[PDB]
Amino acid sequence: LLAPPGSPVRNAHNEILEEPHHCPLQKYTRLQTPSSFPTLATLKEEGQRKAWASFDPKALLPLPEASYLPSCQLNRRLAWSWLCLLPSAFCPAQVLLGVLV
């Protein structure tokens, strides 16, 4: 994706003799980090920490609905929740790798 084949073959004579000399290091373009490969334990720990860092009871029970509920129903409604995450959302992008066991 970042470098499709089709570039002209490198010529030593052109790089040495011709003026101005043409080398792949002459014209350089800044490159953003395309992707990274994280360890599975780091992925799991980061997911757990991020999930527990955004657990707001006030967000799950918006007013004025939460003001007309007894204790048991409120605690029952706060019992369960779920979260979803995406690879490309992180900077830089992450790619999963492992062995199916």
Curated annotation (Swiss-Prot):
Gene behind the chain: CTC1
Family, as annotated: Belongs to the CTC1 family.
Disease link: Cerebroretinal microangiopathy with calcifications and cysts 1: An autosomal recessive pleiomorphic disorder characterized primarily by intracranial calcifications, leukodystrophy, and brain cysts, resulting in spasticity, ataxia, dystonia, seizures, and cognitive decline. Patients also have retinal telangiectasia and exudates (Coats disease) as well as extraneurologic manifestations, including osteopenia with poor bone healing and a high risk of gastrointestinal bleeding and portal hypertension caused by vasculature ectasias in the stomach, small intestine, and liver.
Superkingdom is Eukaryota
What is the protein's given name? CST complex subunit CTC1
What does it do? Component of the CST complex proposed to act as a specialized replication factor promoting DNA replication under conditions of replication stress or natural replication barriers such as the telomere duplex. The CST complex binds single-stranded DNA with high affinity in a sequence-independent manner, while isolated subunits bind DNA with low affinity by themselves. Initially the CST complex has been proposed to protect telomeres from DNA degradation. However, the CST complex has been shown to be involved in several aspects of telomere replication.
Localization terms from the record: Nucleus; Chromosome, Telomere
Quaternary state and interactors? Component of the CST complex, composed of TEN1/C17orf106, CTC1/C17orf68 and STN1; in the complex interacts directly with STN1. Interacts with ACD and POT1.
- Full protein stretch here: 513 to 613 of 1217
